[PDB]
Design an enzyme around this catalytic site. Sequence first.
Site, PDB file in Angstrom:
ATOM      1  N   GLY A 128       3.917 114.694   4.210  1.00  0.00           N
ATOM      2  CA  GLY A 128       4.435 115.891   4.845  1.00  0.00           C
ATOM      3  C   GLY A 128       5.922 116.079   4.576  1.00  0.00           C
ATOM      4  N   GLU A 129       6.504 117.064   5.267  1.00  0.00           N
ATOM      5  CA  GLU A 129       7.917 117.374   5.137  1.00  0.00           C
ATOM      6  C   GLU A 129       8.564 117.319   6.516  1.00  0.00           C
ATOM      7  OE1 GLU A 129       7.675 120.157   1.293  1.00  0.00           O
ATOM      8  OE2 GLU A 129       8.121 121.264   3.155  1.00  0.00           O
ATOM      9  N   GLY A 130       9.731 116.663   6.596  1.00  0.00           N
ATOM     10  CA  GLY A 130      10.526 116.635   7.810  1.00  0.00           C
ATOM     11  C   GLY A 130      11.708 117.585   7.662  1.00  0.00           C
ATOM     12  N   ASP A 140      15.773 115.763  18.420  1.00  0.00           N
ATOM     13  CA  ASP A 140      14.453 116.371  18.353  1.00  0.00           C
ATOM     14  C   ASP A 140      13.378 115.353  18.733  1.00  0.00           C
ATOM     15  OD1 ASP A 140      12.362 118.200  17.905  1.00  0.00           O
ATOM     16  OD2 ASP A 140      12.475 118.030  15.698  1.00  0.00           O
ATOM     17  N   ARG A 144       5.466 114.387  18.201  1.00  0.00           N
ATOM     18  CA  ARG A 144       5.264 114.626  16.782  1.00  0.00           C
ATOM     19  C   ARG A 144       6.206 113.756  15.949  1.00  0.00           C
ATOM     20  NH1 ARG A 144       7.612 119.757  18.348  1.00  0.00           N
ATOM     21  NH2 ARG A 144       9.849 119.397  18.186  1.00  0.00           N
ATOM     22  N   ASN A 145       7.306 113.287  16.558  1.00  0.00           N
ATOM     23  CA  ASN A 145       8.307 112.485  15.869  1.00  0.00           C
ATOM     24  C   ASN A 145       8.249 111.025  16.318  1.00  0.00           C
ATOM     25  OD1 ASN A 145       9.276 114.454  14.175  1.00  0.00           O
ATOM     26  ND2 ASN A 145      10.799 115.193  15.673  1.00  0.00           N
ATOM     27  N   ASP A 197      12.708 109.866  12.053  1.00  0.00           N
ATOM     28  CA  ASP A 197      13.717 110.885  11.797  1.00  0.00           C
ATOM     29  C   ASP A 197      14.814 110.837  12.861  1.00  0.00           C
ATOM     30  OD1 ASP A 197      11.969 111.524   9.703  1.00  0.00           O
ATOM     31  OD2 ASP A 197      11.614 113.610  10.378  1.00  0.00           O
TER      32      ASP A 197
HETATM   33  C1  LIG Z   1       7.320 114.372   7.774  1.00  0.00           C
HETATM   34  C2  LIG Z   1       6.496 113.122   7.984  1.00  0.00           C
HETATM   35  O1  LIG Z   1       7.462 112.049   7.932  1.00  0.00           O
HETATM   36  C3  LIG Z   1       7.039 110.746   7.953  1.00  0.00           C
HETATM   37  C4  LIG Z   1       8.090 109.815   7.967  1.00  0.00           C
HETATM   38  C5  LIG Z   1       7.851 108.459   7.989  1.00  0.00           C
HETATM   39  C6  LIG Z   1       6.521 108.034   8.002  1.00  0.00           C
HETATM   40  N1  LIG Z   1       5.960 106.793   8.031  1.00  0.00           N
HETATM   41  N2  LIG Z   1       4.608 106.867   8.046  1.00  0.00           N
HETATM   42  C7  LIG Z   1       4.269 108.151   8.021  1.00  0.00           C
HETATM   43  C8  LIG Z   1       2.847 108.533   8.017  1.00  0.00           C
HETATM   44  C9  LIG Z   1       1.873 107.711   7.461  1.00  0.00           C
HETATM   45  C10 LIG Z   1       0.552 108.109   7.462  1.00  0.00           C
HETATM   46  C11 LIG Z   1       0.219 109.346   8.006  1.00  0.00           C
HETATM   47  N3  LIG Z   1      -1.114 109.801   8.046  1.00  0.00           N
HETATM   48  C12 LIG Z   1      -2.352 109.038   7.812  1.00  0.00           C
HETATM   49  C13 LIG Z   1      -3.053 110.002   8.812  1.00  0.00           C
HETATM   50  C14 LIG Z   1      -1.709 110.762   8.990  1.00  0.00           C
HETATM   51  C15 LIG Z   1      -4.331 110.743   8.356  1.00  0.00           C
HETATM   52  N4  LIG Z   1      -5.002 110.244   9.600  1.00  0.00           N
HETATM   53  S1  LIG Z   1      -6.529 109.660   9.721  1.00  0.00           S
HETATM   54  C16 LIG Z   1      -7.462 109.793   8.234  1.00  0.00           C
HETATM   55  O2  LIG Z   1      -6.407 108.262  10.011  1.00  0.00           O
HETATM   56  O3  LIG Z   1      -7.196 110.504  10.666  1.00  0.00           O
HETATM   57  C17 LIG Z   1      -3.795 109.494  10.072  1.00  0.00           C
HETATM   58  N5  LIG Z   1       1.145 110.153   8.549  1.00  0.00           N
HETATM   59  C18 LIG Z   1       2.436 109.752   8.548  1.00  0.00           C
HETATM   60  C19 LIG Z   1       5.452 108.949   7.994  1.00  0.00           C
HETATM   61  C20 LIG Z   1       5.709 110.325   7.966  1.00  0.00           C
HETATM   62  C21 LIG Z   1       5.715 113.182   9.276  1.00  0.00           C
HETATM   63  C22 LIG Z   1       4.340 113.393   9.248  1.00  0.00           C
HETATM   64 CL1  LIG Z   1       3.510 113.597   7.736  1.00  0.00          CL
HETATM   65  C23 LIG Z   1       3.623 113.445  10.422  1.00  0.00           C
HETATM   66  N6  LIG Z   1       4.193 113.312  11.618  1.00  0.00           N
HETATM   67  C24 LIG Z   1       5.508 113.108  11.665  1.00  0.00           C
HETATM   68  C25 LIG Z   1       6.295 113.043  10.535  1.00  0.00           C
HETATM   69 CL2  LIG Z   1       8.002 112.779  10.721  1.00  0.00          CL
END
Ligand SMILES: C[C@@H](Oc1ccc2[nH]nc(-c3ccc(N4CC5(C4)CN(S(C)(=O)=O)C5)nc3)c2c1)c1c(Cl)cncc1Cl
Length: 276
Positions: free
Chosen positions: A29-31, A155, A159-160, A173
Amino acid sequence: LANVSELELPADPKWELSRARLTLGKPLGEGAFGQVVMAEAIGIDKDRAAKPVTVAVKMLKDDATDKDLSDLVSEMEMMKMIGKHKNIINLLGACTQGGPLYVLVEYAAKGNLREFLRARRPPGLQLTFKDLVSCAYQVARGMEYLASQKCIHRDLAARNVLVTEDNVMKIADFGLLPVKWMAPEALFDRVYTHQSDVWSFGVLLWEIFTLGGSPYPGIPVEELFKLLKEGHRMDKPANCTHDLYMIMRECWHAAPSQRPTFKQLVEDLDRVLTVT
Ligand SMILES: C[C@@H](Oc1ccc2[nH]nc(-c3ccc(N4CC5(C4)CN(S(C)(=O)=O)C5)nc3)c2c1)c1c(Cl)cncc1Cl
């Protein structure tokens, strides 16, 4: 618009990761600044030196100039200054030499707290009260630490906060409709303090105890401005006790100094966690 010719970025040896170790994967995703992608880094786990560990890589967006570069760098450098803690997304390394800036940070397999809770609600085709308190406590510890390192999130929201495979809450973040998390003084007067984060934390509690509910449901922002000034607040969630509700309300005192510190919140949540 960025400066036309800066020096290439200096290496910080102790954090530098060989590019041979990194393999980029699916966008996540994008932050605020840049995007995040999934990746594998061999050797991150000191105890299992040959194992590819899944990490998250912060990098420039596809349409970015090098204006965005200074932001990504600043973030990295903040993370280094702030240092390590269990309940934050920690810096794991970087690729700064001989190619694009890649900033490696901890991977949270279960996504953010909002979607973690929403996905584990009772409907669909078991989440306990203690779990919810545990989440809140862990987020409070993270913020206590950040506040102790002179860090203001600006923020804070579910979600964060990210959830790892081992159900660890990790604030994301912290290096730099979101209006529903803003304290009045931040919203109206552009003032940001640790005490404005506490307000946000109060809203975060509400998120936790509605199992990832959106705050002020069905209330448009223009109304929100008015009703905050009138001194109205969200009502107790279904899954919330009186004591926990009082903690939310203390977070939402109009006067910032009357809000508790994160230190106090950690203590408060600890008591609620321990008797449960
Ligand atoms: C912008 C992005 O920034 C980051 C920054 C450090 C990270 N460390 N780890 C993640 C991360 C890793 C995996 C992940 N996904 C795997 C899943 C969402 C898909 N599902 S599932 C298949 O298990 O149902 C969980 N999302 C985020 C991550 C994301 C983000 C996202 Cl995509 C979602 N919510 C908050 C933010 Cl800030």
